[PDB]
Design a protein around this ligand. Structure first.
Ligand SMILES: [Mg+2]
Ligand SMILES: [Mg+2]
Ligand SMILES: [Mg+2]
Ligand SMILES: [Mg+2]
Ligand SMILES: [Mg+2]
Ligand SMILES: [Mg+2]
Ligand SMILES: [Mg+2]
Ligand SMILES: [Mg+2]
Ligand SMILES: [Mg+2]
Ligand SMILES: [Mg+2]
Ligand SMILES: [Mg+2]
Ligand SMILES: [Mg+2]
Ligand SMILES: [Mg+2]
Lengths: 197, 258, 140
RNA sequence: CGUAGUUGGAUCUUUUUACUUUGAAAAAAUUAGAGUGUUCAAAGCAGGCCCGCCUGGAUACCGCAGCUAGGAAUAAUGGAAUAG
RNA sequence: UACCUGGUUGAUCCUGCCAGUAGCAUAUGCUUGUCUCAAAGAUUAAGCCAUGCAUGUCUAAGUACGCACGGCUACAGUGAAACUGCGAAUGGCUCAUUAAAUCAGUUAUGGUUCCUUUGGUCGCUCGCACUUGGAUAACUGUGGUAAUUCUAGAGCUAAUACAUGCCGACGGGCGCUGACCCCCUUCGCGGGGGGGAUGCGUGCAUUUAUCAGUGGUGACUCUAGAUAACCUCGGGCCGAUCGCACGCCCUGGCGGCGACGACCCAUUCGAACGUCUGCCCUAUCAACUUUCGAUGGUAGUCGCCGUGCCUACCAUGGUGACCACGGGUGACGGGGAAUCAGGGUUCGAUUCCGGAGAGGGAGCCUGAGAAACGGCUACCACAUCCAAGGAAGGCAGCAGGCGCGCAAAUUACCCACUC
RNA sequence: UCCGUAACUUCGGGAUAAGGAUUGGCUCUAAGGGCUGGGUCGGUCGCGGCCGGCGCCUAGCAGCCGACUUAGAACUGGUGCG
């Protein structure tokens, strides 16, 4: 079938090489997963060594990392906004290893409001304006010092949508994990999205 | 081939098994085990082609199925189990307790040791790694693994383990002046003291070994097996003490014995 | 000093950049090859640099003169050798070209200087080697 | 005429290579060759000595390339001239 | 043994070939008492093949209610068949393909897989068990078919098949949360030190982010540790199994040895893809490659993994008189073989190593391992039974036959040796 | 439009040789330009300037504006589409 041999290539000199064997099985390739967004549908492939790799055909839920607090939650993927490899993978909503996605921010607002007692992306009362005992209220005041998120990243929490990045290989591992874009890597991809608009 | 080989031709066999070329077409391909195929000694050609206990192959399995053969304190019933260097074959019915160590020509000598020398053996430390919860490990030249070894035992050193226990008794560091045996190459079976360990980054290291006559020779570090500390070998050496005579100096030894 | 030329963001994948001068990953390769100054203080991103990337040097180490410098980050060196013919008991000059990855840490390489290369895992269809040390020509 | 190619004068203690020597690492069979009265020989790895004992199953060679340590004649090559 | 002789002229010295001479290996001719070794349908046709055989397998230890035999109350003990397991990817044959390809030496996988064997690991996880569920074969009973190692329907019945699933360890500890108590100050504000209920989490393997710098390396983005989590229903692990001998504690409760299985780490046999150097003839083959990947960059996809392997977006490269590219080969490569003073010349289908293919191509299933052919699936070629409806095929396995030719053996006996 | 083109030849030609593929609709995607402002501190009075300490767009950003054309892709129809 789909072969990923080297001997169908021409040589370095440009000489056409003649095949010396039939195409062997350890040179096989399989079709691409083309993982979309939707209710979870995963197929398993029996591979060499009797092992199994999980290829996902539809995924809506991922595991992304906030990075600068080591806060990783299991959130939900909204859609794909950027792909450096192919523009037309954005329009068909395909999830690949480096594509820039857009996720729901409510597990990251909720953890932040519990770890700092400070509203994030707000224009119930119990976790924020709680009556704390003064030893406990002391502890939240040195966390209050370093509670400032950058201005590009507080914009995201108001629309409830974080701009994120895939890091795993969906269609090999069957998952979609990654990290939240922040810092100069954020504003690099922000103006690429603005330029396409 | 489409998968692994299972036969072994007679002329393609290792040289030191000393098989002959008119008995049959094949040689006993040793099973997978702790020793390499070119570095082993299968149990069938040890009992039949050295000891003359059996005359055919079917008479070897009639010995082995009656569980008269022990290797490293354990009963092995396969006639092509790979026995190798520093191994102890215990027959224990005739009460013989062999230990396989190379002679000075480079093949396994039929060597008898005392039945309290057969309680232990020696092993070359091939690999050191730590495991889960920070637990160190150790891998010998045999495929055995020791959990919680001594902190000083590093790579290429020689340990002494107890059979039927499987724990470390004593060890020898790879140093200058220690007493080693060569387990590969053109110096297979020669014994001497370590003169210089010559390092080459990336490539192989070469160890110069000085024989107990004044002769010197060099071998790769992957063939050096320390057998003694200083000048004292911790096993009983065979007849000749690992001295490689020249072809003239072994002629007259025959000629002064007629 | 501006590296972001491609569609994807270029970063060294061990340096975490967004922590509450950005640091610079570089490693030391073996065999007595000193990591150059521009690899240590420079800002280029290259996953095929042996000093700042994912290339581990193992195997053979060779040499040759630079002949072409027209691919992106890849040059062509000619190692020029001398083959023996036993019948005529004389020699015969042969050569061989090689495509070799060249890092931005070696700034000014010119056509005709001695380049020490070391082999690594395959990087392209033809590139198996990687520049480790640039030695210039005479009078330069 | 002329580019490749080939080949290049003398010169010095009386940097990279080539060269030379050595060491490793190199499948057996075959070849060379050791030992041994297959009745001889081609062969074979056997055998031999009065409860068993003794003993062999050698050594060499294996272009070139790659690796290793000595040698520094020959042959290339390199250092200070806008001194940077 | 570093060897020459006849032949141009009327005669001579030459250049020069022709002819002798000697092996070697194929055919053949005539002849042939003994005996020891031994090649043998490679050359033409990798042409086509009648018949037979060449791959199956059971221990005390997965499943026996076949009286098929069989001794004295779940099950004596043999045991056909059938399920399950394992092998069938080795061996054997042939040399068509193939000219930096195969292959050889040399190195690498710090760029990957690995049934088995051997050694680790297997109460490390805080969360009906004195045994769980359904099905099916053998068998029995009804058949269909011209036909085959075709199978249908109905009634049984098993598990180390297939499912499902608990106790125990197991007292907690460790992280976070923090009600709350407590102590020392303080004019006070404030500040300082412990205890702590209730909740959340907890082990390996997996996947991603981050922190720190137990052991290793020439060199790690290595190993190990810390933290936040995740963990695929087409589903990681954490024993609902079997045999020996059976003791020991106070009905109960423990215990010796094995077998079988396990995710994972090593190991062994390897495998695959890379590094460097090496190949016959040909220029009446001088330029080749490239938006149908040619060279490189970035990001991915695929894959067991590195990689233009493939896709997208870019760059315009890459190779060549040091013989590229193209063509040829009475080309499988090598160890080797014949000849030989020294150099050489020619051969190597052929018992060892490596590769390839099973009429031509192509696609796959199963499995650790196959693009398998004594496995399927097509189409082409050919060919076999047929009641014309259909069914079955692959001797470059051993024998044998036809054909082709100058050209090549018995449809023998045996698992006794080698394995 | 994209490929592909022989004999022959006065080397110009032959040539639209010959031969083949593609063409609709719809929804997008790229690529191809032009005008403006890069002025760091009022040093500081004729909310604007008068002469200069005070600064580094310098791998160009930012605003607005503008035609037409080429290539690629998804969908879609009774295979229809110059
Ligand atoms: Mg010569
Ligand atoms: Mg000179
Ligand atoms: Mg005459
Ligand atoms: Mg003649
Ligand atoms: Mg085979
Ligand atoms: Mg292995
Ligand atoms: Mg041919
Ligand atoms: Mg095949
Ligand atoms: Mg045929
Ligand atoms: Mg096939
Ligand atoms: Mg057959
Ligand atoms: Mg004949
Ligand atoms: Mg015309």
């Amino acid at each position: 079938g789909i072969s990923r041999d080297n001997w169908h290539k021409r040589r370095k000199t440009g000489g056409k090489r003649k095949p010396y064997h039939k195409k062997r099985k350890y040179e096989l390739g399989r079709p691409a997963a083309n993982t979309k967004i939707g209710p979870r549908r995963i197929h398993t492939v029996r591979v060499r060594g009797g092992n199994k790799k999980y290829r996902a055909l539809r995924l809506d839920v991922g595991n992304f990392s906030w990075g600068s607090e080591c806060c990783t939650r299991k959130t939900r993927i909204i859609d794909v906004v950027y792909n450096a490899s192919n523009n037309e993978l954005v329009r068909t909503k395909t999830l690949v290893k480096n594509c820039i996605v857009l996720i729901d921010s409510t597990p990251y607002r909720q953890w932040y409001e519990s770890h700092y007692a400070l509203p994030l992306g707000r224009k119930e009362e119990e976790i924020l304006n709680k009556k704390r005992s003064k030893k406990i209220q002391k502890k939240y005041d040195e966390r209050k010092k370093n509670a400032k998120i950058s201005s590009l990243l507080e914009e995201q929490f108001q629309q409830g949508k974080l701009l994120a990045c895939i890091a795993s290989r969906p269609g090999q591992c069957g998952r979609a994990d990654g990290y939240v874009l922040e810092g100069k890597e954020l504003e690099f991809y922000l103006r690429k999205i603005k330029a396409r608009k | 081939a489409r998968g692994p080989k299972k036969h072994l031709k007679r002329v393609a066999a290792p040289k030191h098994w000393m098989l002959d070329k008119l008995t049959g077409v094949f040689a006993p391909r040793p099973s997978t085990g702790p020793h390499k195929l070119r570095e082993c000694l299968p149990l069938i050609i040890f009992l039949r082609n050295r000891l003359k206990y059996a005359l055919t192959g079917d008479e070897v399995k009639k010995i082995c199925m009656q569980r008269f053969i022990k290797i490293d304190g354990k009963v092995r019933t396969d006639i092509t189990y790979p026995a190798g260097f520093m191994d102890v074959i215990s027959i224990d019915k005739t009460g013989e307790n062999f230990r396989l160590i190379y002679d000075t020509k480079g093949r396994f000598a039929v060597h008898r040791i005392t039945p309290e020398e057969a309680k232990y053996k020696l092993c070359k430390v091939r690999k050191i790694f730590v495991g889960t919860k920070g637990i160190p490990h150790l891998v010998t030249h045999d495929a055995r693994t020791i959990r919680y070894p001594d902190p000083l035992i590093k790579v290429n050193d020689t340990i002494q383990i107890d059979l039927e226990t499987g724990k470390i008794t004593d060890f020898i560091k790879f140093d200058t002046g220690n007493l080693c045996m060569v387990t590969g190459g053109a110096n297979l079976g020669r014994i001497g003291v370590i003169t210089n360990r010559e390092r080459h980054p990336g490539s192989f290291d070469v160890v110069h070994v000085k024989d107990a006559n004044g002769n010197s020779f060099a071998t790769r570090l992957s063939n050096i097996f320390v057998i003694g500390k200083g000048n004292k070998p911790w096993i009983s050496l065979p007849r000749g003490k690992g001295i490689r005579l020249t072809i003239a100096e072994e002629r007259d030894k025959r000629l002064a014995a007629k | 000093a501006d590296i972001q030329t491609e569609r994807a963001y270029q970063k060294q994948p061990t340096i975490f950049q967004n922590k509450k001068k950005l640091p610079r990953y570089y490693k030391n390769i073996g065999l007595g090859f000193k990591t150059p100054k521009e690899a240590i203080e420079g800002t280029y991103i290259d996953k095929k640099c042996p000093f700042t990337g994912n290339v581990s040097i193992r195997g053979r180490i060779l040499s040759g003169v630079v002949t072409k410098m027209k691919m992106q980050r890849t040059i062509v060196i000619r190692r020029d050798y001398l083959h023996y013919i036993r019948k005529y008991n004389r020699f015969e000059k042969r050569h061989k070209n090689m495509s070799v990855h060249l890092s931005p840490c070696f700034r000014d390489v010119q056509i005709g200087d001695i380049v020490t290369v070391g082999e690594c895992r395959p990087l392209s269809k033809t590139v198996r080697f990687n520049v480790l040390k640039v030695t210039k020509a005479a009078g330069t």
